[PDB]
Amino acid sequence: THADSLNNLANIKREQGNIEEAVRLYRKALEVFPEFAAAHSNLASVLQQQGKLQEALMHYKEAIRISPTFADAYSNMGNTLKEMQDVQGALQCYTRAIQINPAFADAHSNLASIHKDSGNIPEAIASYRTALKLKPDFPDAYCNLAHCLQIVCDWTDYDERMKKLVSIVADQLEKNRLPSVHPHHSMLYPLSHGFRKAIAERHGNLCLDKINVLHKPPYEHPKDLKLSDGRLRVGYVSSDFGNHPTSHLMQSIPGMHNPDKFEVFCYALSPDDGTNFRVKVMAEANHFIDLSQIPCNGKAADRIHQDGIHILVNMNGYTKGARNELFALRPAPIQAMWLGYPGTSGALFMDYIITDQETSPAEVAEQYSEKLAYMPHTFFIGDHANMFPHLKKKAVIDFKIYDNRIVLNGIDLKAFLDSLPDVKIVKMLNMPVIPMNTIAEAVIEMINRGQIQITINGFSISNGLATTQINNKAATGEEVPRTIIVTTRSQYGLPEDAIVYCNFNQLYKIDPSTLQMWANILKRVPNSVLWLLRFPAVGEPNIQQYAQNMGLPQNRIIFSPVAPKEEHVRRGQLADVCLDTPLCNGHTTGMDVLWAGTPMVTMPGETLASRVAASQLTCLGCLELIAKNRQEYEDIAVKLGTDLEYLKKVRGKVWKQRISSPLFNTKQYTMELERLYLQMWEHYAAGNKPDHMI
């Protein structure tokens, strides 16, 4: 009873976020009563929260030795093992907890979450429904279930589901509980801007609570650039220096920084995955520090302070692998959110968010806890000019003239074309056309028979479906292909004689409203098709069914598998038009379609995430592809699918402007980012505090 009062106090101290005081009290409980199963399990749980995973495991096992049927200890032990990447151990614990007590809702929810993470969405949904049957008031299970349903485009009772998510968040905010909607997912649901901001703020708060155990004073920050020989020391912090979308966007940026005025430190939160992405940032940054080797956030943050960083740049936000505890400790006088996270941090510890006028207009500035720091064009950038230079030019084969039926790309394309007798040059600067011919017939035969490659006139000619067999680093975008590649509509079962609208996003970004718009467009344009991905495959029959109920026959939507990075980008050349997802736009995916020369129709919303595509298109200089409402989006899209001369014009415009605009110009981007960094620095060095920048 003395023991229980200590334990109960510790429990409350924990819920409040006084982690140190909770630990101290559980240990007191165990001094007074060593065989206290619950106190061991609760201490284990808080040690797990602090990263002390082995010490946690020890206490969970003591709890179970004391009470062999303590299902809750097994459930929480399972979470600890999952955090240590021991999936097998985790499943053994979850299944043991459910065997002890089949009515234990939390264990069902934990099992569901590991099914989800493993790619077993139907089993995750099933386990979440068991949890909700057992305990109907269970916000974590309801919101995680809602995300599973989103992932597979299960829209059963969609509008009441959405109302219920909002309702749960309202209730959770007013009670100062951690909201069950993850900040990253909050963009997909019709929550208020205040709610989205508050969800983010509460998640940042978990990092503040974790760093308080350390007892660190404020760090003292540079007031001038004297220790760094007049150089601004910029620190980029990311878990994604490796094969990840964010590296596919910004891997050239570190090495393009002006070493006369900047000194670049890249802090990796992940170990080296062996990829060229990681090799490049390690080689080209002035300094590369692997913080994955420094688990303790205190020691890791000290390193950033003694490197003397002026601007620390958060590339994760609330994405996997983040360590925002590093930014909670404020080791640098200016802390900015950049590129990797398409939302606000909600946190006081972040000063700016780097964005732009189109993406985040001054009006909607109360979305963000940060001050707006505008790049002059778009804050978005892509490494496509360096990664896929073989797509800078193309040739076609005239089967029956189309730009997107049978396409050739390669670094040595020019020399191959010059080896051929009868090549026609169509001005657009230009598109070589190989006529139907023995050579043209040899190529089409390789494709129709699914062969890997052939040789024509000494040139290597590769089937675009076989890139991982020819050169797996070229397939991933780690190397530029060294062969000429052939890409065709026939490879993907797309019609030779109709308009192909595409969208290559994960299926979770589609909602009922969006698919209704796409169905309207397809009905207005006979024979045309919508080209989607199995992303994941189990989303396919749901999409097809909701489209059938809207009046489209099944043949109007063609699904392809997710491809390796280079194939994905290359095959966008086969589409006529990309239809962007208004709920959450293609971000990296948007840069990808534009690099192929494919116009993208978008309807910007209010969230940062719903406005990225329109910012890209503005920078690109194609204002005619931005819709102000649903009717406009459909008219634009139908116009592009019926007015074939206007299609040819708009495509020609995207094809040229991907080079002549700033969109993919990483040097210009880096230089503009450098100016913006100096503004931020001077503003502060002159005694001022963070303010908006335009």
């Binding site: 964010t246 990797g340 971000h587």
Partner: peptide
């Protein structure tokens, strides 16, 4: 195999 942005 295909890396993506995740929560």
């Amino acid at each position: 195999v295909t890396p993506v942005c995740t929560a």
